[PDB]
Ligand binder design. Structure first.
Ligand SMILES: Cc1cc2nc3c(=O)[nH]c(=O)nc-3n(C[C@H](O)[C@H](O)[C@H](O)COP(=O)(O)O)c2cc1C
Length: 138
């Protein structure tokens, strides 16, 4: 499997790592890829797309790298299964509600409730691992 993410200070990156650990613990292999190093063609062959991005202003996906990536794959992901996650600070998850709506709008099937954690995982570490385990059970 593959996990693609954008992280500005490392919070979402840490989540990606933990999610990967859960998939690996379930017996499967997974590679975490920063959005800047992703190859669209290879990503599009995947059964499930696991995508993560922290909340940027104002309650939107990161604009210089992540959003362009999403816009680029938008027309080629109808029917694909996707799992969403990300870290946020002061909001209540609005950016993720929108991200979920957007992906559904492109024809994707959002397989699980998006995982959102405030700031660094730390206390939510097991939650991240468990989310990975749920995806591996799909
Ligand atoms: C410029 C900027 C704008 C932000 N806007 C929001 C926002 O609208 N809502 C929110 O909850 N957090 C907001 N945050 C906080 C980040 O989502 C939060 O610090 C998160 O933990 C960053 O994760 P990352 O290290 O993976 O980037 C913003 C952070 C930055 C740097």
């Amino acid at each position: 499997m593959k996990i693609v993410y954008w992280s500005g200070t490392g919070n979402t990156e840490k989540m990606a790592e933990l999610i990967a650990k859960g998939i690996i613990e379930s017996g499967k292999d997974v590679n975490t890829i920063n959005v800047s190093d992703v190859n669209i063609d290879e990503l599009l062959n995947e059964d499930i797309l696991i995508l993560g991005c922290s909340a940027m202003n104002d309650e939107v996906l990161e604009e210089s790298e992540f959003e362009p990536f999403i816009e680029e794959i938008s027309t080629k992901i109808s029917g694909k299964k996707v799992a969403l996650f990300g870290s946020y600070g002061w909001g209540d998850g609005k950016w993720m509600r929108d991200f979920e709506e957007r992906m559904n709008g492109y024809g994707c099937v959002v397989v699980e409730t998006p995982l959102i954690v405030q700031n660094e995982p730390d206390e939510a570490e097991q939650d991240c691992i468990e989310f990975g385990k749920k995806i591996a059970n799909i």
